[PDB]
Amino acid sequence: ELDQLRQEAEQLKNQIRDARKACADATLSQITNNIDPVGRIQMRTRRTLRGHLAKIYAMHWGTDSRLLVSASQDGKLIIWDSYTTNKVHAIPLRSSWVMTCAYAPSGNYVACGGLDNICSIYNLKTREGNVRVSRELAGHTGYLSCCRFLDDNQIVTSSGDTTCALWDIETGQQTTTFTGHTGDVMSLSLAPDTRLFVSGACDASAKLWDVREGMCRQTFTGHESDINAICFFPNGNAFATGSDDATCRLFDLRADQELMTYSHDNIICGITSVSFSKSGRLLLAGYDDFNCNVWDALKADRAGVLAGHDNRVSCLGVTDDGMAVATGSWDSFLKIWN
Amino acid sequence: TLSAEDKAAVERSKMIDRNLREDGEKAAREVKLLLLGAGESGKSTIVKQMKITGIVETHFTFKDLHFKMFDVGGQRSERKKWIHCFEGVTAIIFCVALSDYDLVNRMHESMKLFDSICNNKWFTDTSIILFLNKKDLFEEKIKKSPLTICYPEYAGSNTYEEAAAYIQCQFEDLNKRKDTKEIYTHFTCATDTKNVQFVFDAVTDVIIKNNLKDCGLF
């Protein structure tokens, strides 16, 4: 009788695949044929933020596009004023094993976590003048891969226990949990309106969740190896997944389909970070080839190289206004490119 | 030029730089050990001797030296996704047991784990401190059961010294880079005080080698 369940599931899977393929569709590259390539893209290191003494693992730009928070295994969260390379806050951490960092949209709080299975919330704008722990959100049974501030009072966490959670900072309780991944959820990306989000796990699949509704809506299986990074297109109607297959892929929420693949034969190593531009015309992929690539998203050709890092490019971010792109590698260096 | 407020901001940034420098200097002399093992390998006894959810932490001191031991047995998600975070630990403490040479096979799983973690891209120059727990009872275990279950290539003797030597050389013949890293091996006894002393001596040797490499004097 369980075989009947499996047969129904596989028949539905085949029907979904048939519906996807038989949309009477056309290849993306065909439509983006007669558009002018962006040309050679040259970006210089305007600023180099130094002060970390260990491999940094994540950074996040503030919504003012001036302050950025960076996390490293040396057990320090450093908030930098990118315009003057000034440290404004240095927060020690209870556990030095941190691989996540988020900056609140309002700028009041930050969050960080890692192998300790919690990403605590730090309050920056304190009357006492220091930075103190607001809440210790606990309940995950795995290392937190990424927690992003959905709101000033809500956060979304994705850990290595094949699940994601939505928290409420006031009470520190899991408001909603999302399940369905059969592997360590490695990346989490929020929609521009913070209504939907996308989670990418090690089962070579990505899933789209509604935070207010609380269940999977669309699933994408195009990659081969683990998916390490996902970023939404600025329009919110598409997203890009970087995997360990050395290829990034552009996925369409509108069509539940694969749009483009950015693969070059000279690259055989995975992607640790993916981000877009303000207009979504440039896709910045941070490879562990000690350098970063900038791909013309529409035409799929590589537009430029952002070499100048002495180790694997771990984290990558782009400001909201698109003024600059910041890259952080395992050499404990932050580089601003403009 | 700068105003008063941004000059004060620069002063604050410089002060933060100084404090971070002191914390980094203090933490650069922390002896980091990564405790490993397959299962039922008796590393709980090991951490108990050294001391007196998520990855558990132990901190202690021995002869003016601060040791941080990280036990990661509670995170059974995937080693390939977070094992690179430990690139930089002073040593890896493997605690294979010697009373599981026949029960489920388990010795083969321990050897497979040793191959997986030793011939690893992240741990190339990182030494490994092998611990052979439960030594004091397979002596009387082999008074009934033979070694033929574990090893088809051994038919020599069911005695302590012979079996210990064969297991020693079998685990030693598992690393390919026999120059960039060394595998110190121990025979943990009946709760003897030397268990911490051996770790101290091994980590001092590893620190001396690392310092020689840093100076280029090696």
């Epitope: 302050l67 404004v88 700028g107 003048g129 | 008063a4 407020e5 004060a8 901001a9």
Partner: single-chain antibody
């Protein structure tokens, strides 16, 4: 947050005294400190300053020399040693905490103050000394600088404080536009280089007092004559 201040009183001219300010409620080590005077029937007068870690120390033009200032982080205290106390330093003294980083609000908290009863600057003018105010109307207070306060980094270093009768001044607006924490939204700051205005919309009780405009472009910090508002 408490800044309790003591050591003032009666000293003859030429005497020596020490003013202590004990801090309890915040991280004294990271905060910079200021000592600010106020004559018995005049406005505020910046006196001294210590940065965090005592790295940089500044003194006013009229007190540099005989006046010395120091801090002790261990017990969270700030000392001002006054010598050669002429019959001009008779005043009411305050200690003001101030943290300096991108987005901070300097001069946010003020001490209660002590009382001493001794026996090339950016002149800033407030055109109004006293003005009647309807308890249900909106009123504007104008400050006028000599040197333009709009710096090259886009910040206008103008601060607006309010002192109620018998209480320490409280920071209303910092950097000419940003309301301080806890300040009701009835207060706004506007204007342009060398011409600034604080607007109070829908004035009510607890708005009477004297409003002071201060510059932070460079030391020495200087204030205005202060505008008195009466219902």
């Amino acid at each position: 947050v408490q800044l309790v201040e003591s050591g003032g009183g009666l000293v003859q001219p030429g005497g020596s005294r020490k003013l202590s300010c004990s801090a309890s409620g915040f991280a004294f080590s990271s905060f910079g400190m200021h000592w600010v005077r106020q004559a018995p029937e005049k406005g505020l007068e910046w006196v001294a300053y210590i940065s965090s870690g005592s790295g940089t120390i500044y003194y006013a033009d009229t007190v540099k020399g005989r006046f010395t200032i120091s801090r002790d982080d261990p017990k969270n205290t700030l000392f001002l040693q006054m010598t050669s106390l002429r019959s001009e330093d008779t005043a009411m003294y305050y200690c003001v905490r101030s943290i300096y980083y991108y987005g901070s609000s300097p001069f946010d908290f003020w001490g209660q103050g002590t009382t001493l009863t001794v026996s090339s600057d950016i002149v800033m003018t407030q055109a109004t000394s006293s003005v009647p105010v309807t308890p249900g109307e909106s009123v504007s207070i104008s400050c006028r600088s000599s040197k333009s306060l709009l710096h090259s980094n886009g910040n206008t270093y103008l601060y607006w404080f309010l002192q109620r009768p018998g209480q320490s001044p409280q920071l209303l607006i910092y950097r000419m536009s940003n309301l301080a924490s806890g300040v009701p939204d009835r207060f706004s700051g506007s204007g342009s280089g060398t011409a600034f205005t604080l607007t109070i919309s829908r004035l009510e009780a607890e708005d009477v007092g004297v409003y002071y405009c201060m510059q932070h472009l460079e030391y020495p910090l200087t204030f205005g004559a202060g505008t008195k508002l009466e219902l």
